[PDB]
Symmetry: C4
């Protein structure tokens, strides 16, 4: 009873909402008629799996059995076509009930009319055994009518695109890979049908003496050898190679060769387009860094900077972004509030634990300080703090080595200047590339204004010193 | 009388302005000479439709009648060329009056000189019956002069581009589809003319014994069979296949084969370029999400985050953007003032109606509150509100489930903390992925400052509690 | 005397600065040695023009005279090679003086060493008559040494790239067109040299009985027919066609055919890449609008908006951006101060002249008001001003039609509300798509604070009403 | 002893941190077992260099020795295969110790299981001499088993990608060039193996009378001639040319020809994709300027500006950005504090030294003024300062010429207006394109508030004047 209703999985929770959001859709399926199928249920998924396997089997086997074999009266050929057309006739009946994702679940007002207006005629032609009707009522004209079963490609293309739009939502998949697999699966099928058609056309003309089958003397070999030579001819026309020694003499050979060349040329052009779209999406973060550095060196060339400054800015961007493009401010802006706190507790927590003033504080005070740190990268030779300055910023050390006028990683300098609000006494020069965390004086005074209990403690520090 | 003036349709209102803006253009057409055509009128549209149908008919039929048939004295061939060249001679006369969109409507100062300086000579050559003049004054040399009618391609290319620049403004069309249809329509016509030229060249030489027509023994067949073999040869040269058993022996066969190969190669290269430009524009919102997540995981790799935090940020972006790239702030910034209010009345109106304090308010007060809500997404396990905090924000619940230390969809929590301005007492943990609407305390105090009548009501609440 | 110094043209003013900036470079050329050429002067331009014409002539004519003709002792062939190698030997001497744009003008320290370290050996080999030396000292081995003159392609590629980097600065040119013309000019030259090589290889072997020349029986025809057949063979190998009836039998035919196929395949791949890069840059402003609307409809699909709101936002973006992407704020930010004032005096000046209060003002007061107008687009059905509101904004009408609860273009409404600072009395509904200019109350109060003389005038208005 | 530990070079400092960060990794290698190799050490680099040279040698030589020579019992062929398979067996043993960069250094828990689960079976098959075992236990069936040595391509692809991900971090390399060199190196190897396979297949069938070897009569020639003809056949199938006079008759010739055509077609499509991705990254800063100017002229076309204003804005953008796209504000934002000061000391220091008031100041005062200058570009004809204005900004002159109502480069005007805070007396018109540095009055008053010692000096100026 509940197999026709949408179950609660990851896809239904992502496409509807909570569990209560899925219960409303289940009640909506209940508010429809007697037995109405929902297109996200498990019954429709199992049925579409069975039908997709049958469509692949029929669209591979049916041209080969028609074109390369003797008669349509052999006993495995009749049982295979009658039992398959029964299942494709049940797929016509069950499409009156499923409803169309635009969802539509009301019956029979919108489903039946929206199905009759769009896809009923093609499914009706590809469902019924048309050739057996003309055979019972009334021989080589029935082999043309048996190719109406190849209109089951239209409901194959519909049923593949219904699953992929689901499975882009359930999983994380690249769209280029899915689309190029769809293109490869179409190209193989068109080459197979063209290989069957190359031998189908001279067979209806009782093998004229100018066709390739009578020239190469392969009228009475096995069907495998005939299929191999016909597929070689169709693939050499498809990939635009050049076949044979003489130009085609008969009139249906010329036009069908030209049709094969046009279809192969446009399929190969679409394959090149998909391969280019796949290759351009591989190295995006490497490419955007290159474009950004092109703009940087263009800014250098506009103001006519010297060569040493150009080299120095290049070394700075190499040690800053590392050939890798990102923008930390927008990434920290997009995240939520518990996710920003978790990243800072990995990077900035351990350096503040070295400082004796912040170690004894409450954790409600420390986390407000940790959000206002800023990441800075320096060079060997750069003077970090200069003498005679106001000293507004306090620095923590993550990596690198620097000297006061040696301080290794995990240290700190300029701490007492933010408390005394006076002139800096010493000067600091970086010995190598340093990674620092900076705290300004106003960003600390705001947090002192947020907590008056910690404000009393730093007043007792200032009275002692 | 008013057929020469621009009528008032969607295109004229979009390209000029209001109805009064179109009346000024109609008065400008009236201020011109005796009978002056405006290029956006209905007369020019109907005339260009008739002329485009004639150009397609002549550029298809005229090479086939010249190259594959016997004489130019048959009675349907004379009537078809005299009645068509009369219409192409009227198109030369009416171009003195229409005026050129750069508009120009003044006559005959700018129109006549700007037409004589650009396109008069080509239209004059492609208009007049040049071969009949040389035939009356004075035979196989007239078949070369009859191909001057193929310069009607130049005014075909002009008349197609005049409609498409209109119909990009009237309707919403993709530019890649229009441009690739123009390329396909050009490629078919060049292949048709090359198919006629392959048989035209040996005919003027009275079929030498080394040409392909005398080798394949098809001098005296029908014109359909000759056209099919000539088009097969031209298409195999065009798609770069390889033709025949021997290399071409005669000198006009070699150079014209080389010209066909060069023209086909450059047309196929432009087709691959257009197919790539069409494929790259299909999945843009899917691709920009992938580039953004490449930058996100690069930001992860720079600071060397642990694996569980990487997985958690990935799950957050999956449940936030859903594989789909957009930026809500700029989209809400671009819209107008009545359009922003209509979107909020669909999403944020129903949740505020649950709250008993905002239900009895005036609608002028509620809509100022509704603009300042912010959309937030949380995770299972994240603590939404923590104990011991100031509690500046009030939260409404759209989806998801959470627990106080169960609250389903449509609920709210933290409401009394914004009124009391005190410390939060309880803690809230989200059981699953929640979608919340947040209102800060300052964004509500601004709206309380906007309306002093509602400020009195919340004072009566604070005195009772 | 002044022909060796850089003259004052548009390029020199763009690459140096003012006239005084060019005088310093002229004095720098004067501070060099006795006769030193500057690479931006007129002498170097005229000399490079003469040399580029000679290089095109020699690189076209020299393979054909060697491979297809009888002897190198004919009197026009000796005079043409002696007088040309004199000019290519003067180009070796004058490269010791010109100096290299990295500029370098100091002689002979940097110029001579930087020339000897890079390009002296190739120019020395391509300059001197090597084969005549071996002919005087000591026959078919001299035809191989005469192809050392084809190393003049290396200084051709240098002299073309020196002009294009100049002429991208003098004029505005698309880079894709220049680069694809360079590629086409290289491809034609490689096909020409391969056409000469196809006949050069069997000639040194005294025409073996297995080569294509002895099979097709063309040993004793004219040089034009031999060149046409050899170029057809090289082009069919170049465009990957397929030649002849039998596979090549001799060993130098196989490897040189394979070299031709590899060179043609990589040149055709680079041509497809350049054609794609050219096609992608044609419709950029059309494509960015499509990407922006993809993000808009994705924002619609995320919050699950109804269909009528989707249609309404689509109509708004059609009447706002018109299928055309731009961002007015950044464009107005990039411009200078006199350019922003000129655009506003075209668009916003005529509407403010209708208002009687702003007509009698000083022009210093009006232009400060005109910078703070904002462009707004409304829809039919939207209520512009509602009753019971504060009325902070005053609106001017450019296009469209609206009704008070009819006001055509050029009108205004809501003017008295900004002066009285009271509640709006009437309501305005737009009948069609309107284009309005908005002025807020604070943006007008700032300009009233800027000018106290106009502040007295609006006080006399408020006392009368 | 220290050869197995990661040394301190530029790559290790970039991938770990400081010297103390590398010492922790060396202690981590010490904390592992008896002899454990670190994958960034020098031993693994030298070993991978030796193994990559051996893999290139074996994958080139091994098909040619099997397919084109007589027997596998010749004495150089046995010594070359036994001594090479010893080295490929040592590479199997040393992969139990190196540890996998995901790093992993713990043994044998994670290394051995993570190696057995992924790549042990392929390396085991490609390591051992399988054919000699079947030869000792028990002839043409051993030539098929000897091609198991061609599974050494799998550890070649692994060892190339391990170096390139290192050498993208050590040096600055474009990713497109590296990836297209990998593709070319793969394509040459596949064409070589296909050339060996074309002759391998008829040899196992004892040269049937229908194969190409017996048709072209080359059974008993040398191995070089057979290799040249086989490679020509495989390359003509690979580049999709068309081979021979007749279609292939035998069944293994048809299917292997079809496999060659499919492999060549997909490799050529990937080559076109890589060439397009390489060409699109050459002219990025030229292309972004073109896209920006497309948006500019679209903003012009939306508001229907006159032609002279369009020309004037075009001339402004030509003299502003010079066909070259950059954004100075974000570039100055990304840099550090000592790098911003170094650029200003090149450009803005020399112009301020002309002014007599700023020459006698302290250098701590001047550098705070220099950060607040703004770069401006004017046109000929634009009025820079107008009479009757407040005069908030002071201007310095870098280039260009202008007149007061002549001032060359290096001058200044409007200096006294910022000190007097009064109305400007004169008007300035630019004679040509000027480049100016602007200082506002509030940006100077902030620096006067920063330094009270300089504030006393400008008070003594104001009392004298
Ligand atoms: C991957 C392509 C999927 C093939 C689609 C169907 C199953 C998809 C899945 C099947 C297995 C999955 C395993 C998944 O790994 C996880 O599930 C995460 C970790 C975990 O929870 O175990 C990653 C990709 C996924 C490969 C993709 C495919 C686009 C549809 C083709 C089916 C039909 C239309 C011919
Ligand atoms: C679509 C391409 C249009 C073909 C152009 C001419 C009619 C255009 C129209 C004709 C029918 C339209 C129906 C339209 O649908 C609506 O009109 C919106 C709903 C409604 O109001 O009904 C969408 C696309 C439109 C397909 C496009 C085309 C670019 C020009 C080619 C004509 C000539 C140069 C050979
Ligand atoms: C256009 C390509 C130019 C061909 C280059 C040399 C002259 C350039 C000029 C020659 C004529 C120009 C006319 C110019 O129009 C104007 O000058 C603006 C209006 C005016 O002032 O008249 C636009 C493009 C310009 C076409 C381009 C080209 C890139 C270099 C090739 C020369 C050599 C390396 C083979
Ligand atoms: C360049 C490609 C490098 C070839 C890689 C290996 C050495 C790399 C180096 C070797 C020489 C370098 C010289 C370097 O120039 C400098 O070192 C800066 C100035 C200086 O310090 O001297 C620029 C590029 C570098 C060319 C690149 C390449 C991607 C790996 C291929 C090796 C193996 C996988 C087949």
């Amino acid at each position: 009873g509940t197999l026709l209703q949408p179950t609660v999985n990851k896809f239904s929770l992502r496409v509807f909402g909570s569990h209560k959001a899925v219960e409303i859709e289940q009640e909506r399926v209940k508010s429809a008629g007697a037995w109405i199928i929902h297109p996200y249920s498990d019954f429709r998924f199992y049925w579409d799996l069975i039908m997709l396997l049958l469509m692949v089997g029929n669209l591979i086997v049916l041209p080969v059995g028609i074109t390369f074999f003797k008669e349509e009266n052999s006993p495995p050929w009749i049982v295979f076509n009658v039992l398959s057309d029964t299942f494709f006739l049940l797929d016509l009946v069950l499409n009156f009930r499923t409803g169309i994702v635009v969802e539509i679940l009301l019956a029979p007002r919108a489903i039946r009319t929206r199905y009759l207006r769009t896809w009923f005629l093609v499914d009706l032609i590809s469902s019924i055994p048309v050739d057996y009707i003309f055979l019972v009522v009334e021989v080589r004209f029935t082999k043309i009518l048996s190719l109406l079963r190849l209109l089951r490609l239209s409901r194959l293309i519909r049923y593949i695109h219904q699953w992929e739009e689901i499975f882009h939502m359930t999983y994380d998949l690249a769209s280029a890979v899915v689309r190029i697999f769809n293109l490869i699966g179409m190209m193989l099928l068109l080459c197979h049908w063209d290989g069957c058609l190359q031998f189908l056309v001279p067979m209806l003309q009782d093998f004229p003496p100018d066709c390739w089958v009578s020239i190469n003397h392969m009228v009475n070999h096995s069907w495998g050898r005939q299929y191999s030579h016909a597929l070689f001819k169709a693939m050499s026309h498809m990939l635009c190679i050049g076949y044979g020694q003489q130009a085609p003499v008969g009139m249906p050979d010329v036009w069908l060769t030209m049709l094969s060349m046009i279809v192969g040329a446009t399929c190969y052009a679409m394959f090149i387009g998909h391969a280019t779209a796949l290759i351009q999406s591989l190295d995006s973060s490497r490419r955007q860094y290159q474009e950004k550095y092109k703009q940087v060196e263009q800014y250098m060339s506009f103001h006519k900077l010297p060569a040493d400054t150009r080299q120095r800015i290049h070394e700075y961007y190499e040690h800053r972004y590392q050939g890798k493009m990102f923008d930390e401010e927008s990434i920290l802006g997009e995240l939520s509030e518990p996710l920003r706190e978790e990243i800072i507790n990995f990077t900035c927590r351990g350096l503040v634990a070295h400082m004796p003033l912040f170690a004894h504080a409450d954790p409600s005070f420390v986390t407000a300080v940790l959000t206002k740190l800023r990441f800075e990268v320096f060079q060997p030779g750069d003077l970090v703090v200069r003498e005679g300055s106001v000293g507004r910023k306090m620095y923590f050390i993550q990596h690198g080595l620097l000297s006061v006028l040696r301080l290794t990683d995990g240290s700190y300098f300029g701490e007492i200047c933010l408390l005394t609000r006076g002139r800096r006494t010493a000067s600091v020069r970086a010995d190598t590339y340093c990674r620092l965390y900076s705290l300004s004086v106003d960003h600390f005074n705001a947090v002192l204004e947020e907590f008056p209990m910690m404000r009393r403690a730093f007043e007792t520090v200032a009275m002692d010193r």
